[PDB]
Paper text:
The ‘cap-binding’ and endonuclease functionalities of RdRp work in concert to perform the essential ‘cap snatching’ of host mRNAs to generate primers for viral transcription. The essential endonuclease domain within the PA subunit is a particularly attractive drug target. The chemical scaffold for our studies is 4,5-dihydroxypyrimidine-6-carboxamide (DHPC), which was originally developed by Summa and coworkers (Merck, Italy) into the first-in-class HIV two-metal integrase inhibitor raltegravir (Isentriss)30.
This mimics the binding of a nucleotide base in the native RNA substrate, which may account for the potency of these inhibitors. As anticipated for a carboxylate, no significant activity was observed in the viral plaque inhibition assay at 50 μM.
Author numbering:
A (entry chain A), B (entry chain A): 1 to 53, 73 to 196
The structure:
């Protein structure tokens, strides 16, 4: 599974995931499933910010803590939108809202409720994806066009198939909570 | 001059410049001219990467050292281009070359020679801008279109005028070497 991650994900995503795990005392060599989950979530967030017009989204995930809050606070001062208690993943300049992106191996509705009642913030938009092709967003507002969401859902589908071909999918799908 | 920097530059550029100065033992409150020079160089590099087609440029400046070399090494493994000895500022996916960007207050030809004989690498492309409107590149290959270079040269012109209106230009133009 470790060799699959460094093979199907770019070195920039792999390095970001390795730093996030080591910041919590986890070895990517041992918790290889969470290693892949972080890479997958990072890849989806980067594809999400490329699926609209130019400069429509500001990336917050992947940045270090100080720069991430520098971007968040700069937006709240310029646009007046409320400041989130936790770091979101994107900001929609067109819709004037923060975006939280989730990638689940289980069911898409369980992850939305778990992330909605955990974020608590009324303004932050939520958009969940899954490896089987489902997606659900806040109030059915999927932000992106059907073509940009299709390449994200197809990308997750391709990842699921490659690990299934490598007999790594069921161990990955199982270890989510 | 310190109040001008935090006013005319976004908080993301200001925070990046403050970190770069503190990594060398310099206080942005005292060396305010180098504080502005770092912000200006960062702003030009970010506008440069927005002046072509989407995904035409990869940003290397502004990243921390580990991520910057992660991007550089990933490009040298994917495209086979030679690995630079020093971190460049951008990579041109269309031209398959690294880009070094310079912003000088003096003359544009002195800065090109000083940066050419210092980089020594034959493949790295050089592109210098100035606050008065001059620009020169490697072998007259300016990479960008005249419209994208115009908004960069106009931006530097606007910066020069605001500090001149604040009686800060001549102290800034003088402290370059
Ligand atoms: O998309 C998501 O599900 C998502 N979830 C989070 C949650 C809730 C807030 C904190 N947190 C973390 O995961 C912190 O990191 C670790 C938490 C626990 C164990 C970890 C082990 C290795 C690496 C990171 C870890 N934070 C988001 O920014 C986000 O996008
Ligand atoms: O554009 C350019 O002129 C440009 N110049 C450089 C030069 C040469 C390589 C090192 N270096 C530095 O400036 C390092 O930082 C400090 C060097 C010295 C003093 C400093 C004080 C405060 C903050 C940074 C400082 N490096 C580029 O990446 C680049 O883009
Ligand atoms: Mn996140
Ligand atoms: Mn997320
Ligand atoms: Mn540089
Ligand atoms: Mn430079």
């Amino acid at each position: 599974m470790e060799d699959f991650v460094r093979q199907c994900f770019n070195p920039m995503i792999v390095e970001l995931a390795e730093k996030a795990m080591k910041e919590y005392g986890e070895d990517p060599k041992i918790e290889t499933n969470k290693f892949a989950a972080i890479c997958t979530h990072l890849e989806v967030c980067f594809m999400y910010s490329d699926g609209g017009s130019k400069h429509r989204f500001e990336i917050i995930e992947g940045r270090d803590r100080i720069m991430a809050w520098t971007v968040v606070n700069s937006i709240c001062n310029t646009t007046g939108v409320e400041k989130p208690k936790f770091l979101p993943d994107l900001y929609d300049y067109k819709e004037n809202r923060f975006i939280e992106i989730g990638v689940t191996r289980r069911e898409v509705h369980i992850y939305y409720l778990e992330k909605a009642n955990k974020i608590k913030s009324e303004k932050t938009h939520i958009h969940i994806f899954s490896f089987t092709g489902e997606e659900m967003a806040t109030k059915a507002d999927y932000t992106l066009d059907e073509e940009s969401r299709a390449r994200i859902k197809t990308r997750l589908f391709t990842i699921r198939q490659e690990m299934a071909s490598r007999s790594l999918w069921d161990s990955f799908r199982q270890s989510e909570r």
